[PDB]
Ligand binder design. Structure first.
Ligand SMILES: [C]C1=C([C])[C]=C2C(=[C]1)N([C][C]([O])[C]([O])[C]([O])[C]OP([O])(=O)OP([O])(=O)O[C][C]1O[C](N3[C]=NC4=C3N=[C]N=C4[N])[C]([O])[C]1[O])C1=NC(=O)[N]C(=O)C1=N2[C]([C][C]=O)C1=C(O[C]C2=C(F)N=[C][C]=[C]2)C(F)=[C]C(F)=[C]1
Length: 647
């Protein structure tokens, strides 16, 4: 349905109040049920009005005007609901035409560190709420871990580049507002072995289905058997994977043993049986000789010796009958061996390709992920097909930047917060002699976790952060993932496939250039560097890594089919001081709860909060994503406005 659809699109149950709404509307939860149903219709219809046309601000007046009777009659309640939705960024978020121009007198000074999606989303909220917002951004550009390369006809994203399902996804709103050109991804993904030979379909399917099996098995180990701590250490996904593969190999070796025992037993029965038939031939040779030696006792001696001879001959023909049913059991046993090994060398390499795919998805080696919690956010996936931003994901943050007071090339070095306000200190990256001091009432820190982890610190906090926050920083994972962009003047690959795989030759290097993407109008290929390879490869010059790309591609399509690229780009997210990695992951020994601790504001001791946190690493249910970063900016904007303008 329509207004039910709007609730779903807002990640809300269409037919009950959230706890958050119960808090803000206690008169509703404690009042009659009829009024609670009225409340929910107001909420859903208001969201529909916004979502049907997110390019313009949805005001209270226009909501009241578009409500049908009797709902447009409870004016006070309509306003209460509108105000709540707006404050929490469920309407009038993103970029839209303001009907009410911005208030000319501001209220409170907020410094936002970082002009990524989380910083931009919060800034637009706080500016709409009437506050004085200034963003300090170290790079010469907005977008942070959204980073679009453009040169000639080439456009390619070096950071984020995929919108997961639009159903429930706030990026669906931003897409409509900004005009992102999105394009659904075709799912076919052929694999090529390291010699460039295609992986046959049967081997592709066999290994993939086994991959699914192994992983489901780790999840049974974890969440049914509670195999989560071992020898006083938290178990990693990689560790569990090594364990379940070891058990499959044990099982294979056992069925092999059982089968060899069956072989041996059959051979032994034949040896014995042949010895017995041997002696029975010898016994018949003796009776057959006493049959030619042959009176009344002679006429009866032949009858008796024929009775004896042909009785031994029946013993012998019946034993050659067993001889046949046995060497017939033997022949098919030698012809039906169970698998010699669990994974052929090629089978193992292909399986390592699927592992690399998972290390791509989590941006970190599997041996680092928490076995128990690495996919704790699975239950929050959006519905619908995934898409890529054909026109470059920077269109989103660039659009969000319009009208904001953003100081680029401005690197924060120190953040001071007291019960009397805050001071942020920064340097000009083009002239690190030039220094700036920003006084403010509140700081919103959207520095990446990688920057927060940096030792010695890039940014110094005064007073230092509390142990519960720094130890959460210490526990959490911050991964890495890199891309090689190859721009050609001609298309030599299969244009109808968005993906194809290169099966690495070894486990340790399974993530090197393992997956190629074909996603754009023009001839562009992205090659991914995942897992252990991701950090190590940053130490390779551009030209050499491109050469390795080209060698792979020449192996797949032929040496003369692959021309020299006209333009190349190589991400190095770990070495980037403004990222120091790509995005968080749930490290073994961490959990979603660390994401909640990351979101928690700091209050200087006896008082009111001064230092706030946003970014993909602060949102438990949507970490490591653009929409999660976005939502986190909206969340903190609500928290800060509640503090400085009143709930
Ligand atoms: C890196 C990366 C990559 C490479 C990729 C990707 C990513 C990443 N992702 C993630 C995102 O992006 C995130 O989450 C966001 O971005 C966040 O944001 P924030 O929070 O805001 O942060 P930033 O941005 O960084 O910001 C901050 C700021 O700050 C600053 N600074 C620093 N330092 C300093 C400063 N300032 C001042 N001072 C100082 N000192 C900086 O600069 C900044 O600005 C993503 N996401 C999403 O959503 N999507 C996508 O797509 C993405 N990605 C990926 C990964 C994984 O896997 C993904 C995917 O994949 C896709 C693909 C690719 F990429 N390629 C090819 C093919 C495919 C998927 F599918 C999904 C997902 F989910 C993800």
């Amino acid at each position: 349905s329509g207004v039910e659809g709007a609730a779903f699109q807002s990640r809300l149950p269409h037919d009950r109040m959230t706890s958050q709404e119960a808090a803000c509307f206690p008169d509703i939860i404690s009042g009659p049920q009829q009024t609670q149903k009225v409340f929910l219709f107001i909420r859903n219809r208001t969201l529909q009005l916004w979502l049907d046309n997110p390019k313009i601000q949805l005001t209270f007046e226009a909501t009241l005007q578009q409500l049908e009777a009797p709902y447009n009659s409870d004016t006070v309640l309509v306003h209460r609901v509108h105000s709540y939705l707006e404050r929490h960024g469920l309407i009038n978020f993103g970029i839209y035409k303001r009907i009410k121009p911005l208030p000319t007198k501001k209220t409170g000074k907020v410094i936002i560190i970082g002009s990524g999606v989380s910083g931009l989303a919060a800034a637009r909220q706080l500016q709409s709420f009437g506050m004085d917002v200034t963003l300090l951004e170290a790079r010469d550009r907005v977008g942070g871990r959204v980073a679009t390369f453009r040169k000639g006809n080439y456009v390619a994203d070096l950071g984020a580049m995929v919108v997961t399902g639009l159903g429930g996804n706030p990026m669906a709103v931003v897409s409509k507002q900004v005009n992102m050109e999105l394009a659904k991804i075709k799912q076919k993904c052929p694999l090529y072995e390291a010699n460039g030979q295609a992986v046959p379909k049967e081997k592709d399917e066999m290994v993939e289905q086994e991959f699914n099996r192994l992983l489901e098995a780790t999840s049974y180990l974890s969440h049914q058997l509670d195999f989560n701590v071992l020898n006083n250490k938290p178990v990693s996904l990689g560790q569990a994977l090594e364990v379940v593969i070891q058990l499959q190999e044990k099982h294979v070796k056992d069925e092999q043993i059982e089968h060899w025992k069956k072989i041996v037993k059959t051979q032994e029965e034949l040896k014995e049986l042949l010895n017995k038939m041997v002696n029975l031939k010898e016994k018949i040779k003796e009776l057959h000789q006493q049959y030619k030696e042959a009176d009344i006792t002679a006429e009866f001696l032949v009858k008796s010796k024929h009775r004896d001879l042909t009785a031994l001959c029946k013993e012998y023909d019946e034993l050659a009958e067993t001889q046949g049913k046995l060497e017939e059991k033997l022949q098919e046993l030698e012809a039906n061996p169970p698998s010699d090994v669990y994974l052929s060398s090629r089978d193992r390499q292909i399986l390592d390709w699927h592992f690399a795919n998972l290390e791509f998805a989590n941006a970190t080696p599997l041996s680092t992920l928490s076995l128990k919690h690495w996919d704790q956010d699975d239950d929050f996936e959006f519905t619908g097909s995934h898409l890529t931003v054909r026109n470059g994901y920077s269109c989103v943050p660039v659009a969000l930047a319009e009208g904001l007071d953003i100081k680029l090339n401005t690197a924060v070095r120190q953040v001071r917060y007291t019960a009397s306000g805050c001071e942020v200190i920064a340097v000009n990256t083009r002239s690190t002699s030039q220094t700036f001091i920003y006084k403010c009432d509140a700081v919103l820190c959207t520095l990446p976790l990688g920057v927060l982890k940096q030792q010695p610190p890039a940014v110094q906090f005064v007073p230092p952060l509390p142990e519960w926050k720094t130890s959460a920083v210490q526990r959490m994972g911050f991964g890495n993932l890199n891309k090689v962009v190859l721009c050609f003047d001609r298309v030599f690959w299969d244009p109808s496939v968005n993906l194809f795989g290169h099966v690495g030759s070894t486990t340790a290097s399974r993530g090197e250039l393992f997956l190629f993407w074909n996603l754009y109008k023009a001839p562009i290929l992205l090659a991914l560097v995942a897992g252990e390879a991701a950090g190590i490869m940053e130490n390779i010059s551009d030209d050499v890594i491109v050469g390795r790309c080209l060698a792979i591609l020449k192996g797949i399509f032929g040496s003369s089919a692959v021309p020299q690229p006209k333009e190349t780009v190589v991400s190095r997210w770990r070495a980037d001081p403004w990222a120091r990695g790509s995005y968080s992951y749930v490290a073994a020994g961490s959990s979603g709860n660390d994401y909640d601790l990351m979101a928690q504001p700091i209050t200087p001791g006896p008082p009111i909060p001064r230092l706030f946190f946003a970014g993909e690493h602060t949102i438990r249910n949507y970490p490591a994503t653009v929409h999660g970063a976005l939502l986190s900016g909206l969340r903190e904007a609500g928290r800060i406005a509640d503090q400085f303008l009143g709930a």
